[PDB]
From Swiss-Prot:
Residues of the full protein shown: 2 to 20 of 234
Gene that this polypeptide is encoded by: rplA
Annotated protein name in UniProt: Large ribosomal subunit protein uL1
Family, as annotated: Belongs to the universal ribosomal protein uL1 family.
Biological source species: Helicobacter pylori (strain J99 / ATCC 700824) (Campylobacter pylori J99)
Physiological role: Binds directly to 23S rRNA. The L1 stalk is quite mobile in the ribosome, and is involved in E site tRNA release.
Complexes and interactors: Part of the 50S ribosomal subunit.
Superkingdom of source: Bacteria
Length: 19
């Protein structure tokens, strides 16, 4: 399936570190 969406959640975590 196209649930790469999960990997996107990980990248979102990195944004929290920069935020």
């Amino acid at each position: 399936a196209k649930k790469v969406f999960k990997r996107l959640e990980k990248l979102f975590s990195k944004i929290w570190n920069w935020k």
